[PDB]
Design a protein around this ligand. Structure first.
Ligand SMILES: *C[C@@H](C)C(=O)Nc1ccc(-c2c(-c3ccc(Oc4nccc(C)n4)cc3)c3c(N)ncnc3n2C)cc1
Ligand SMILES: *C[C@@H](C)C(=O)Nc1ccc(-c2c(-c3ccc(Oc4nccc(C)n4)cc3)c3c(N)ncnc3n2C)cc1
Lengths: 276, 268
């Protein structure tokens, strides 16, 4: 059949948004999470109607199969049940009735984190140490919230983190291989846990304080795991403090048991931010 | 006929399988063994898809005849009954109490079951699986997807093969099956080498940290997986012989069972 659902089983929640006010635009980001497209909806905020608002629409790929539609609908329901948080790409609407499936989510005016930092390097809006710490604390708080809802990240890194007009860091992908980013136990056993996500967040912080730097440069993938099991971790970023680098290294602890929980990280980063 | 089973004993319960092979499902038959009068035995039912098509109704019966001709073997998931005539097709096959191999070892590693595996136990599993594969090779039998998941462990800790037909898991396919698109028993020997690797690493993902996209060209460079910690130089050389670049030079399954018998007799 098709995603217009001639004989498929939908439902009708309140989240629905009139498709008569949605306008789709340019594909945004290489669609690993799915077919995302920029859009200019009208009256999504419910308190400022008639005001044009940019959003991102998740739609089905041209050769999508039934299981892709089921995954999209289940992802929609998961985003509904997850809840709201300031440091996350939040669900704000959907079009499910009398037409194709469109999941309307929050749009960040400024690109992913990697290119944001890279375009704000001192070779405009220069990124100073305090901005980096605030950013890190933001998405760490978001990571904790996502941890509460038993969520595991598909690929956590700078290119999958967005930043809005208000410079608010938002996390995506909370649902090819990012071997350069995953922990040794996730490389070897291919199991992803909150501890593996702590290691991934350590790599994320490294990428932040190096202002969009490629992890493990020059080390081949075939060798990577071995070097990681030897205990070789990435070196300290240029403009970074010994305490933040020790935090990164604790996130990269060889055993998951001794890695700090996300709440520990949020507390430590709040204390560091307290001293501007 | 002789294999027919009464319909008043089977149940639905849990799927007990994540696709492939068929629509496996849990069941609890009663008095299936001729020696055990009435004690219930847990079994697996290979039932037909809801979208019963023209070829599936023939494919499931082809699998039935397959299990009938293949015979019985200790290290094989064996057919032990079925419900065919005057009702829906329920194929009753052996049941593994302890789950698949991957999770079986993964849950018995040193710091879940509190019985660590011994190198003794690993050599025994390898010998069992080679002894099963040599029989499956004796019959014109083909392995569809040889991996740790498709190998099961009963409550008696007996390795059982759960994939085979009759005349993509890229990390398990041989280079000739990957590049030349040719399938022979030697590719099965390569897959058995990868299985050995994931056994002696106690449920480890082959080529860790290597994505498939680069794995292709790395294999073309001659890259083979490193030796496991719990493996020996002799057994690692065995795995690397299973991974011989020239299929004709790979060891036959009978050579493998002989060598594993030789090593297993040690310290015993
Ligand atoms: C594969 C990798 C290199 C990559 O490019 N990932 C990627 C794709 C798209 C964006 C993106 C997004 C965006 C991100 C995620 C969704 O859907 C979604 N959100 C949260 C949770 C789940 C399970 N799915 C939709 C869009 C946006 C948005 N929303 N606004 C602005 N810019 C964006 N970009 C670049 C990012 C990384
Ligand atoms: C696709 C892959 C990731 C996977 O999960 N395969 C898979 C499916 C089912 C089980 C399984 C079984 C089991 C396995 C195979 C059959 O059918 C069959 N047996 C022998 C020969 C042939 C041609 N077909 C039926 C069931 C069992 C059983 N029987 N008991 C207990 N637990 C089981 N599991 C998990 C395993 C892996």
């Amino acid at each position: 059949l098709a995603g217009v659902s001639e004989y498929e089983l939908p439902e009708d929640p309140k989240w629905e948004f009139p498709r008569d006010k949605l306008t789709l635009g340019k594909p945004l980001g290489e669609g690993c999470f799915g077919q995302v497209v920029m859009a200019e909806a009208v009256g999504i905020d419910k308190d400022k109607p008639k005001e044009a608002v940019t959003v991102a629409v998740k739609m089905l790929k041209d050769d999508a199969t039934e299981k892709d539609l089921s995954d999209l609908v289940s992802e929609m329901e998961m985003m509904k049940m997850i809840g709201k948080h300031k440091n996350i790409i939040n669900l704000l609407g959907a079009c499910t009735q009398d037409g194709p499936l469109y999941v309307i989510v929050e749009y960040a005016s400024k690109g992913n984190l990697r290119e944001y930092l890279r375009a704000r390097r001192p070779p405009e809006e220069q990124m100073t140490f305090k901005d980096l710490v605030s950013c890190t604390y933001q998405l760490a708080r978001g990571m904790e919230y996502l941890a509460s809802q038993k969520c595991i990240h598909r690929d956590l890194a700078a290119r999958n983190v967005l930043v809005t007009e208000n410079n608010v860091m938002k996390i995506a992908d909370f649902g090819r291989l990012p071997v350069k980013w995953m922990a040794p136990e996730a490389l070897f056993d291919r199991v992803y846990t909150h501890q593996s996500d702590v290691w991934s967040f350590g790599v994320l912080m490294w990428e932040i304080f190096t202002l969009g730097g490629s992890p493990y440069p020059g080390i081949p993938v075939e060798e990577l795991f071995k070097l990681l099991k030897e205990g070789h971790r990435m070196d300290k970023p240029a403009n970074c403090t010994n305490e933040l680098y020790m935090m990164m290294r604790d996130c990269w602890h060889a055993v998951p048991s001794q890695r700090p929980t996300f709440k520990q990280l949020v507390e430590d980063l709040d204390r560091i931010l307290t001293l501007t």
